[model samples]
Target: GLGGLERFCSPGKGRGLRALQPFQVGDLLFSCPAYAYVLTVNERGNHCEYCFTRKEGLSKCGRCKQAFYCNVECQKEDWPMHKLECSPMVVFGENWNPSETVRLTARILAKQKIHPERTPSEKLLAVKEFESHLDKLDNEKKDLIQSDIAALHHFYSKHLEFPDNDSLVVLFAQVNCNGFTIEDEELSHLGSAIFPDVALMNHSCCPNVIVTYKGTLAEVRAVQEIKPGEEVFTSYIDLLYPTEDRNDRLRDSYFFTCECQECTTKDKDKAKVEIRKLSDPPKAEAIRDMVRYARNVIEEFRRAKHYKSPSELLEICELSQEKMSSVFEDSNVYMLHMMYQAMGVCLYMQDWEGALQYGQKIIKPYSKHYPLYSLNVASMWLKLGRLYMGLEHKAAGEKALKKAIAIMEVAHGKDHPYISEIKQEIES
Candidate 1:
């Protein structure tokens, strides 16, 4: 069921998911594929209508030109929802483009109408139960939701009955708070979804767990040993950001002040955002420029944001590094930060070679710089191991994973969730 997760309870700060039992690094706490979710306006043509994985040669729905699939079986599986909205596109083509906001609601509506007496799936209601912060909606947002509801009614009037205004509002709110960004192999932001159970885990600046996706299934894994009764956490925002920057981003996006240790604690040095001092004055300006540029490149890499490939971005980073390399030297923390960014970008794209390239570079520096027992090394080793596997270097992969397991044994204990997960990978 929940592995070690207990039911979500409202923390004094707000509602959050908590742990019922101890978890170690790499524990699979919960997993679910999207059986009900929405795609971005044109993503149906880019991602499978059923599984929502990216496909270069998706089979477009012959008539509506909206739904796409990897194969006929996926098309068959998705037809129950697609058939309802397909005709609306045939009639009102471009008018239906902007507000796929209503599409998730539309899908839910279609499912319910097909089986009127049926109850909501447990996964469905996991989303339904999250705190929506509905009272925080301003007038402009409220107006947009109204327009979204109207668009849904326009699309579904012929075949399905519309949800009442109240129900429509509730669905919109549920999605706002619970939706997970769906990305492709390159970690590009493709669309968003309410991942039923995955939505339960709460946020932290310096989180111990991270969510990884495979097709529709969301996998939650521990990056460090989590003790029993310690609430499981994942970073809703970038973990690399400094404390105030993270809090500002969270409040603006999620409507709350963070109570995570990094936010509330007196020890500011432990709040991530690796700080480095450029010791000497040799080409300091150039090195600073390169770091700023690298940060911008990685930060900008979203839908409207940055470059498509890790290579192109890495190319720029290398160009900058070329001039600064001799000046900054290897021990510089800025150098380590850049490597982390490059490795993450490659990892997101599933470019194993690039990840290994950058990951290998970071390992020694991360190990040298951080405490030997810190989870940072453990996370880095985990990536290096996975990257080695991805590159088909079996010996290297196993070695890296074994190293990671050893570090976790010393730091996170011998029997952490991460230990078993890596052991499985090494054996696999």
Candidate 2:
């Protein structure tokens, strides 16, 4: 039996998990649910928590009226801290996403809620306890950790424009956990509750888990079973590109050089090698030349477009496909994804026939790699549904819509915005 987690050698990362023995599919993975939840003003639009049902008209807090709740029970339960930071949460919009500012706000709020009567000095001491854990990390990572800390100070002092008063010192002391020193003005805007555990999981190009929210609760689950000691990862962006492009995007966005195996693999050369095996010499050379020419044409088209028509984009994609067909195999995932992206653009342009053609072509190859329920595959189904509707193929349209909805429901959950959009399209 697999004992406690042990990190060993993984391909890219120095340490990874090892299964003690073979386990079948559908095995249990570790579950980490939010210890405390808060429905910020932005999350009020989603759904009811208790029944996991969609909300029609959200009711606001009697006092704050900013945070919404589906019913009296959730409202009553969330009231304690809502009484404290409700004003600040409503004011800041930039701190909306999973930015450093929001994390600081959460951490500060968490401290206040945990120990409402704790002295100012005691709260600062608690923050020091948390910062102590960051001691062993490298300077770059250590700087990021401290930067997150500094961002909170900057936002409160400069951005929120809080008054300089003794009462605010308690608020800063409560929020900071005393982990690091703070300025007099910086203390004014400190909110509390830092979710340290949620911040630990590193980023990956092909993440094994997906993180999503329900009202206030953040849910993290394995899409695939993570063996013991495996470095649990979540993708920061959509993994739509070939390996090189994927690595470049991750580096540009996250400020870290990703060493993911998928990122390191030379997919273009592998694709070229595979294509050579399938075609005769003359046919292969002709196909390669056409593909190269098609790439140049598409690049030019993208550059020239200030605000081009959808048909213009579709024409460029179609030309590229014709070129690809001459030299390369259609079954490659990279090419398939490119085709899918083009098809999506076509659908956006309302080119139903073109969307249908490219969507179908892309799906046949893509389905081999991605699960049928994957976002990638589901998108193809959605495009097909649109095309069917345009052609007045009512039954086919309905079927395609249903297929897309079912996949999205599994991948993104029924409460996700994309799922809501799909449901509206089907009904309308």
On lDDT, the candidate that comes out on top is 1
Question: Which ranges of candidate 2 are over 4 A from the true structure?
Answer: 1-23, 26-28, 35-53, 63-65, 88-100, 103-237, 253-255, 268-373, 379-394, 401-428
Candidate 1 residue-wise lDDT, 1-428, digit = tens: 55566655556654456677777665666666664666666465667877776658898888887788888898888788777778887888877653556777677666556644523324424544666667888888789888888777777777677767998898887666667777543344566655666666678776777666555556666766787777777778754444665687788668887887667872543323233355655455765565566455445543322535666766655655564465555545545666766776676677778778877777786675544444567677877887778768899989888887776665445654557767878777
In candidate 1, position 244 carries an lDDT of 66
lDDT of each: 0.66, 0.50
Candidate 2 Cα deviation (angstroms), residue 137: 15
List the RMSD of every prediction in angstroms: 7.0, 10.6
Deviation in angstroms for 335 in model 2? 9.5
Candidate 1 structure, TM-score to reference? 0.64
Runs in model 1 with CA error above 4 Å?
1-4, 8-10, 41-46, 115-127, 265-428
Each candidate structure's TM-score, on Cα atoms with residue i matched to residue i, is 0.64, 0.50
Candidate 1 structure lDDT:
0.66
lDDT of 2 by residue, 1-428 (tens): 12332334555543333444332222322332333333323334554323223467977666545566678887676655454455544565445333433344544555455655633333112332332223233566445545554554444433343333333433333333312111011011112223333333456766666544332233444556566445666565556445555565555434446766656674443542235355445465575565556546645766745476666766666666665665556775435645765765765666778768877776666555543435556766776786788799889888988887776665456566657776777788
